[PDB]
Amino acid sequence: SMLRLQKRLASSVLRCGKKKVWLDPNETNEIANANSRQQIRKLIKDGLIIRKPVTVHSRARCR
Amino acid sequence: MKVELCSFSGYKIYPGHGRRYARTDGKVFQFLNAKCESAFLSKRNPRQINWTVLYRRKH
C-alpha cells in the first residue's frame, strides 16, 4: 500500500539518498512487510531493492 | 504591362510589389521584399547567397 517507511529505511541501509533507492514495483506487497532494517537488509541481498547508479555527469566535454 | 524590374536578387518584380531605394549618391535599386532589401542593406554579397540569381549563374 504505502512504502514511505521502507524507502526511508532502505536509504539508511544502502547509505545513499532516497533518490537512489529502487523499490520493485512488482513486489510492492513483499516490500511492505519489511518493517525493520534487518528485513530490509535481506530484501537488498535478494534483489527486491536496488541502489540505482549515480546520474552521469561526464567530464569528457571539459577534457 | 509597365516596365518590368529586377531585384537585388535578380528576381522579376511585378508592378505593385516590393519597394524602391534611391540613395543619396544617385543610384536607384528595387527590391522584391524586405528579405532581399535587408540583405542588400547589410551589404551582403548576392554571389554568396545560394537562392540568389547571381549565385546560380556564378556556380
Binding site: - | 504591362m1 522579376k12 511585378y14 510589389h17 528579405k35
Partner: protein, 50 residues
Amino acid sequence: QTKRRALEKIDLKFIDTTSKFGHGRFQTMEEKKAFMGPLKKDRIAKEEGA
C-alpha cells in the same frame, strides 16, 4: 451617376495572380517552372515511373 469619377470606362491591362499565401512572385505555374527549371521532386518523379 453623373460625375466623371463614375461613367468612366475601365480598360484593364494586368491582373495580379501571384500567391497571396505569402510573398508570391510568380503569376502562373508555367512561369514558375520556366524560371526554376526541373527540381528534385520532379527528377525522382521522372525517374521512378520513367
